[PDB]
Amino acid sequence: MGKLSEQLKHCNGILKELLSKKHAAYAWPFYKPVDASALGLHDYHDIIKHPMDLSTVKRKMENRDYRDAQEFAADVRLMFSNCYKYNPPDHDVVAMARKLQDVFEFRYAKMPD
Ligand SMILES: CNC(=O)c1cc(C(=O)N[C@H]2C[C@@H]2C)cc([C@@H](O)c2ccccc2)n1
């Protein structure tokens, strides 16, 4: 019932939206951990020290791992940051990251106080 639980419900709402059909055209690369081997990205885990994806964020939310909205936001932004760090800015995945991050940031900003 407290503020932290309430803010985490808003976070859970955002997470459900990021995983929803509405955003699937650009969200799908972020659904599961990057399979570096399958994608031929044999330097991925040398460059990205802390992989993150929405299935991992969902597991952590379901497990009550996140103690506050800030911790949840840090993982969602880590996921985007990894994309911007690894990929050349002209790869389609970077455009898709930017579009999904726009959805995230605008709704995260509507956090209940
Ligand atoms: C989070 N996902 C990724 O960072 C990623 C990277 C690459 C990739 O090959 N990156 C090489 C350009 C770099 C050296 C490919 C994919 C793949 O899921 C994908 C294909 C086509 C449109 C969108 C996504 N995802």
- CATH number for position 6: 1.20.920.10
Spatial CB neighbours of 77, under 8 Å, sequence gap ≥ 6: 101
User: Two tokens at 37?
Assistant: 């081997």
Q: Whose CA is nearest to atom 20 of ligand 1?
A: 93
The answer to whether 72 and 66 are in contact (CB under 8 A) is: yes
Q: Which atom of ligand 1 is nearest to the CA of 43?
A: 14
Cα gap 21→65, rounded to integer Å: 26
CA distance 36 to 106: 30
Distance 71 CA to ligand 1 centre (A): 26
In whole angstroms, what is the distance from residue 80 CA to residue 88 CA? 13
How many structural domains comprise the chain? 1
Question: By what method was this entry solved?
Answer: X-ray
Q: For residue 97, which atom of ligand 1 is closest to its CA?
A: 1
Which residue range(s) make up the domain with 15? 1-113
